[PDB]
């Protein structure tokens, strides 16, 4: 069971910054005067670390459910012991796989299963009037649980349970790590005689345990214990008292550590890679200790902002016009064939228009037509009555259906239909429309017949004349114009996309957007994805080409097709950071070279030298850089760049 | 990411003329298709008007047939609707919606709309 | 004088799968596209299936349609059945240069 806190004033988080701390041992394997670099989850140094506090003297207690990430970094400069335990989990709801250690004065245990979380689990202490020592009683972390597959006790941690203001004398380091479903704990107690801004010490944190629990983690909870003595009324709404605490969290990121191991096999100092120059001078040494000289450590180069497009100019169209804006329509059984193609294909004006009726596109979606581009493109036309407009559609039967046109059950096309009555029709009605009712068998899709032989029905031919048993049948439309809506006149238009293995001639539009220039930008102009600046070039080009190369066989001329511009192909920029040392035991900082980026900061002939302040006046040079320029450190004293004395 | 602001209601008029906008951004005006959406209190959906990216043709229920007006421009991409000799019947919350291709892919978009009542 | 039919309350069921039916009764309805479209009670509607074969980016897949020619039918089908379903839904269709709305299907007990 749990209880409710109450409303009350407290103090908002502070952030403190962390020193050299955050270190522990990343294999189980033993090295000895190796300076070995490994790829492991760590803390970084001099890095924002957020900061709670616990101390009652007012009535700050923050245990907010921080999230999980990969790796977290807990230290606490504990000194009454007021600290229980940790708790983890996803949900907190009883219906995920979740942690529970809690140290407890006797044993320490680690069971992990759904228990049922209230909104702030705490630990109750009690003063006892007859013994005057302090014991837990309110034992308030859960409800219940249904069940686990993991549990473990630990060692039986001796502690003290009296709390006190005093200043802290010992500091405990807490690091849990979860891959691959494996928990590793890490842990150090270090004596230390301090209450704030945590020593620049070194103390590697060897590990503890390796609990297999193979569990997702993604939030955690701190458990604190408060006290209840005579002066406080006893209830758990405004009156209380904890003593004096403070703990630290941090989270763990991955970053590449050069560790220094003595004689001892134990670790004495650490090297970062991607934190200061020097750093990374160290660390790709693979030695603490550096000389003068020139340096490179990695390379650098510059990422495209944006990406521009722009097709030529698109003036190709498909005649999609007089196809739909046809005086005369053939008849059902005689429908038109027409081929589309070698045609930018312009649907916008299909779909933007409302006059048509149906617009059902079988096989492919109409939403995606401008990307795509197909080889053929057929159109056929036929005017049929607005009942047998459903029959167009693959699958259905019917006299249309299966006698004057027959669609194939992988139709990847789209069926267009309109309505005109007084254009198909005049006052008198229309008679010149003919349609089949009667044929052998049925007609295979895609086939039409134009034979108008005597269709016989019995098993007695009629010799070829009109009478019984054998009629007509092609026969005539009635139309009115007064008659009903679904015996008025449709106009039905399909259209067909086939693919082959010729080279696709109808496409969509193409779109087209702002040229900018001098920028490291990508454009695509129809024959190459480059990546570079557009400058302004000098040198006309003969009006049939697109294209442009140079001695050495690269595209870096491409003409603007819209504006007939000739613009120039160049990449951004590249290269390496070198550095400049002036020695051990001389100084501590560096400068970085650039060897050909063009951009305190000195503009060098041999590229761009930072931090080095160039003076008129030449000495003897000791460290080489280029083109009759070297660097020393003359007098405070800083690094200087000057021309070479011969 | 597109934004839609409705703000044209607020009062109550028995038979007068009233006026409503819809403010739309990101996204290029002159290119799809609009639409007016209305829902009682209530009830169900129900549609109002349609209009094409250039204004060319608009329609409308043969409820409101007669009366009615919706118009557009693409300077300022912005919606002008104009009501006229209202009724009670009116009581409803009005959403600007956007097409994609037509009237057959469907409305897909709807504002926060704003309440519009008659008394 | 096109009209879509369907049912105000259904799918008040837990965790399973249940289909809801729009129908029409002048014509058929598919000769065009229909849509349903999902809306908060008290805020903006949603759309969760359209082209009758297509739900917007964002959409879980748990949402599915149908068509059956036979009976003249919609159906929408949810799978998952979750705690984010608090809707009513709405059927809509084109006969020719108008829009019809369905009725409405409340669903909030899930």
């Known amino acids: 069971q749990c209880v409710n806190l109450t409303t009350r004033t407290q103090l908002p988080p502070a952030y403190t910054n962390s020193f050299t701390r955050g270190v522990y041992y990343p294999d189980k394997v033993f090295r000895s005067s190796v300076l070995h670099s490994t790829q492991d989850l760590f803390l970084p140094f001099f890095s924002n670390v957020t900061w709670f506090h616990a101390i009652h003297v007012t009535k700050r207690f923050d245990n907010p459910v921080l999230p999980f990430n990969d790796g977290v970094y807990f230290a606490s400069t504990e000194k009454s012991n007021i600290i229980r335990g940790w708790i983890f989990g996803t949900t907190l709801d009883s219906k995920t796989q979740s942690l529970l250690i809690v140290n407890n004065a006797t044993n320490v245990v680690i069971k992990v299963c759904e228990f049922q979380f209230c909104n702030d689990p705490f630990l109750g202490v009690y003063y006892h009037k007859n013994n005057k020592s302090w014991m837990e009683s309110e034992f308030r972390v859960y409800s219940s649980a249904n069940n686990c597959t993991f549990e473990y006790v630990s060692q039986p941690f001796l502690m003290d349970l009296e709390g006190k203001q005093g200043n802290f004398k010992n500091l405990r380091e807490f690091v849990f790590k979860n891959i691959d479903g494996y928990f590793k704990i890490y842990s150090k107690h270090t004596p230390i005689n301090l209450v704030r801004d945590l020593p620049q010490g070194f103390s590697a944190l060897e590990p503890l345990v390796d609990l297999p629990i193979g569990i997702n983690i993604t939030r955690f909870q701190t458990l604190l214990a408060l006290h209840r003595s005579y002066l406080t009324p006893g209830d758990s709404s405004s009156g209380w008292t904890a003593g004096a605490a403070a703990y630290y969290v941090g989270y763990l990121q991955p970053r590449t550590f050069l560790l220094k191991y003595n004689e001892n096999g134990t670790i004495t100092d650490a090297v970062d890679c991607a934190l200061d120059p020097l750093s990374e001078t160290k660390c790709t040494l693979k030695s603490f200790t550096v000389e003068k000289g020139i340096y490179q450590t990695s390379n650098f180069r510059v990422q495209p902002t944006e990406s521009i497009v722009r097709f030529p100019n698109i003036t190709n169209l498909c005649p999609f016009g007089e196809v739909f804006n046809a005086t005369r329509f053939a008849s059902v059984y005689a429908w038109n064939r027409k081929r589309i193609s070698n045609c930018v294909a312009d649907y916008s004006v299909l779909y933007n228009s409302a006059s048509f009726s149906t617009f059902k596109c079988y096989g492919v979606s109409p939403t995606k037509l401008n990307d795509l581009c197909f080889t053929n493109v057929y159109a056929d036309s036929f005017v049929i009555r607005g009942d047998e407009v459903r029959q167009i559609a693959p699958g259905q039967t019917g006299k249309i259906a299966d006698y004057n046109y027959k669609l194939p059950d992988d139709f990847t096309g789209c069926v267009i239909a309109w309505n005109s009555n007084n254009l198909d029709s005049k006052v008198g009605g229309n008679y010149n429309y003919l349609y089949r009712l009667f044929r052998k068998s049925n007609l295979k899709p895609f086939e039409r017949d134009i034979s108008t032989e005597i269709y016989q029905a019995g098993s007695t031919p009629c010799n070829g004349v009109e009478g019984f048993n054998c009629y007509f049948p092609l026969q005539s439309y009635g139309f009115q114009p007064t008659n009903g809506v679904g015996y008025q006149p449709y106009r039905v238009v399909v259209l067909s996309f086939e693919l082959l293995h010729a080279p696709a001639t109808v496409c969509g539009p193409k779109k087209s957007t702002n040229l900018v220039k001098n920028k490291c930008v990508n454009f695509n102009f129809n024959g190459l994805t480059g990546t570079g600046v557009l400058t302004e070039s000098n040198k006309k080009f003969l009006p049939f080409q697109q294209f442009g190369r140079d001695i050495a066989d690269t595209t870096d001329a491409v003409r603007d097709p819209q504006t007939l511009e000739i613009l120039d192909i160049t990449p951004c920029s590249f290269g390496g950071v070198s550095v400049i040392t002036p020695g051990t035991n001389t100084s501590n900082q560096v400068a970085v070279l650039y060897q050909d980026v063009n951009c305190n900061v000195f503009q060098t002939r041999a590229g761009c030298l930072i931090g080095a302040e160039h003076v008129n006046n030449s000495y003897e040079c000791d460290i080489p850089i280029g083109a009759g320029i070297c660097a020393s450190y003359q007098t405070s004293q800083s690094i200087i760049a000057y021309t070479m004395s011969l | 990411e597109v934004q839609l602001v409705e703000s044209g209601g607020g009062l109550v008029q028995p038979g007068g003329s009233l006026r409503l906008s819809c403010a739309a951004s990101?996204?290029?005006?002159?290119?799809?298709?609009m639409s007016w959406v209305r829902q009682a209190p209530g009830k169900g959906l129900e549609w109002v008007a349609n209009?094409?990216?250039?204004?060319?043709?608009?329609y409308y229920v043969d409820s409101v047939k007669g009366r009615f007006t919706i118009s557009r421009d693409n300077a300022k991409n912005s919606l002008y609707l104009q009501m006229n000799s209202l009724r009670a019947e009116d009581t409803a919350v009005y959403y600007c919606?956007?097409?994609?291709?037509?009237?057959?892919?469907?409305?897909?978009?709807w504002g926060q709309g704003t309440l519009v009542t008659v008394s | 004088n096109f009209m879509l039919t369907q049912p105000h309350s259904v799918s008040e069921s837990p965790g399973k799968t249940v289909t809801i039916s729009c129908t029409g009764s002048?014509?058929?309805?598919?000769?065009?596209?229909v849509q349903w479209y999902q809306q908060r009670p008290g805020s903006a509607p949603t759309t969760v299936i359209y082209?009758?074969?297509?739900?917007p980016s964002g959409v879980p897949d748990r949402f599915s349609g149908s068509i059956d020619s036979s009976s003249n039918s919609a159906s929408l089908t949810i799978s998952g059945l979750k705690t984010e379903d608090e809707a009513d839904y709405y059927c809509?269709?084109?006969?020719?240069?108008?829009?019809?709305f369905g009725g409405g299907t409340q669903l909030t007990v899930l």
């Open positions: 919606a956007r097409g994609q291709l037509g009237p057959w892919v469907g409305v897909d978009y």
């Open positions: 990101g996204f290029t005006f002159s290119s799809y298709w």
């Open positions: 209009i094409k990216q250039d204004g060319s043709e608009k």
């Open positions: 002048s014509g058929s309805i598919a000769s065009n596209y």
């Open positions: 082209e009758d074969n297509q739900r």
């Open positions: 809509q269709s084109y006969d020719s240069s108008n829009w019809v």
